[PDB]
Ligand SMILES: Nc1ncnc2c1ncn2[C@@H]1O[C@H](COP(=O)(O)OP(=O)(O)OP(=O)(O)O)[C@@H](O)[C@H]1O
Ligand SMILES: Nc1ncnc2c1ncn2[C@@H]1O[C@H](COP(=O)(O)OP(=O)(O)OP(=O)(O)O)[C@@H](O)[C@H]1O
Ligand SMILES: [Mg+2]
């Protein structure tokens with residue numbers, strides 16, 4: 111069967127909700143961005159940054175988790191032979207309590223997450239304020255100044271040498287006091303990625319576009335991957351949206367499978383084409399239905415957990431400007447050729 | 454009987470006052486918002502923020518207490534089998550002495566409130582400045598830096614795994630000096646919630662409409678719940694108000710029950726729908742009557758301890774403003790249709 115297994119009906123509601131949460135759908139934009147990101151990670155070729163953009167609601171975190179699991183399963187063989195290796199280190203940024211991004215906390219979080227191997231691996235890292243303990247945890251005292259933590263992290267990254275270093279919600283790097291300090295933050299990240307030779311991938315929303323192009327050097331060592339949303343004007347995106355709606359409808363653990371493609375305009379209105387938002391909506395509706403133990407779904411249940419107009423309006427305002435900034439037309443090529451003299 | 458038991462008459466005035474105080478009537482808005490919040494926190498589905506909007510008069514605090522007691526009741530059978538878990542934890546935001554909201558005090562109070570289980574559960578928290586003591590209390594040294602407290606609170610939240618984190622009086626987070634500080638405060642809350650995977654429900658007054666819509670990320674990961682007051686235009690609202698008032702009249706531990714529905718216009722004038730205002734007004738009047746051992750109260754008794762006009766109009770100015778912004782009309786729905794192209 112192409113839908114949910116029928117035997118889930120006898121089993122209670124909790125496992126049905128668990129199955130729907132653990133269920134993941136494949137849609138053309140996700141697979142295209144996934145293959146592009148995997149190709150870029152497989153070899154950076156002098157690149158130190160990947161700026162993956164996309165709306166609030168797209169699949170960026172799920173894409174990151176899928177990439178990490180794929181790379182781990184790819185590397186496990188070589189891990190069976192060569193020890194002291196971590197394939198992927200994936201980290202999320204932290205919004206600071208103060209107005210300036212805390213580099214010390216970023217460095218100590220990197221040390222914490224990066225170094226969780228079997229205790230057999232010992233490296234007595236530089237600076238005397240960082241050491242192991244009786245439980246395998248990494249001990250970082252406040253006495254350790256930030257540059258010392260940077261040096262220790264550089265040593266650890268150089269030895270372990272992960273294939274890619276994920277920085278989720280990278281837009282938190284913009285919390286700075288000086289306007290010009292944005293380029294300084296990006297330069298600090300670039301310098302960290304230079305002497306370590308570790309590919310840094312920056313996962314962020316459209317707020318990350320403030321870092322998109324600063325200085326020629328950062329432009330050279332970065333690639334722009336756009337996790338575009340399924341638009342409404344292009345018919346093919348509409349067909350993809352209807353296909354993913356049907357795929358979701360097939361895997362709804364209900365006694366009766368609801369008809370869902372019919373009300374696709376409402377779904378596009380309240381999700382803007384982002385698959386994550388639609389999955390959230392359907393998860394909420396399914397949870398409500400399973401709580402009521404009703405056979406099937408209705409538009410009513412849909413409206414109860416629907417995103418309100420005001421919050422959905424703000425998202426599209428953010429998305430409209432972000433896509434406008436990231437829009438590359440054939441005309442833009444013409445001025446580039448005209449300026450260079452290739453016209 | 455549907456009212457107070459008659460045995461309370463023999464008991465002194467203190468016992469009758471206690472019985473009326475611990476009594477909590479139920480009204481359609483209360484039960485509706487309670488069910489909506491229960492279904493929202495039964496599963497968050499990728500949502501990190503709940504914005505319970507309501508005037509200082511409804512019943513936000515008692516709704517929070519009801520939710521905590523309900524979930525505490527629900528989690529007892531699993532607690533008897535599994536230790537090291539807290540069903541629900543919640544605190545109240547602190548208005549800071551200085552200009553800026555103090556994150557250190559917020560973090561330390563959250564850690565204090567969350568970590569009050571039986572003394573068997575030892576998790577040897579991170580940061581050397583956090584530990585237990587001879588009396589079982591959690592001691593927080595002033596030398597502990599704020600990010601260290603944040604990491605310790607994160608580890609405690611992950612290990613204990615609460616169902617929902619309540620932040621009452623959440624409008625206190627707006628004590629900022631920069632326009633963008635207003636936003637990265639909520640960004641810090643969102644980072645704390647994401648990194649722990651814990652839903653954060655924010656109960657606050659209409660001042661929280663400031664935190665309503667900031668950027669697509671916080672617009673998506675938040676669901677707005679409006680604790681609307683019983684207005685005067687809706688006949689159903691008037692009927693519900695009169696039913697609640699009649700239940701209050703029947704539940705007064707008085708020797709002779711007075712007729713309360715007569716001065717419904719006066720009661721709505723001095724309460725404008727807030728059930729809590731009516732409740733504590735009636736508590737005031739009943740206590741004043743019981744002080745003089747009178748068999749009944751009078752209009753002048755209500756007038757003796759009512760709410761003055763100067764304040765009463767002040768909530769109206771705030772309330773009509775918040776209800777104005779929180780008004781979602783069909784015109785806004787069609788505006789999304791035109792902008793997105795689904796018209
Ligand atoms: N293709 C997909 N199939 C199934 N579920 C998906 C898919 N894409 C996203 N989700 C759902 O989205 C949620 C994860 O968040 P998601 O990756 O969509 O966030 P994002 O909007 O890309 O990132 P951010 O948090 O930075 O805004 C989960 O509930 C997950 O089930
Ligand atoms: N439905 C209710 N039945 C009985 N008493 C109620 C009810 N709702 C509120 N109260 C009373 O209101 C008081 C608690 O304050 P309440 O939660 O109503 O205030 P609020 O203005 O909504 O919020 P806040 O605490 O932020 O000021 C208590 O005296 C409680 O008895
Ligand atoms: Mg995400």
Ligand SMILES: [Mg+2]
Pocket residue numbers: 510511512513514515729
């Ligand atoms: Mg209250």
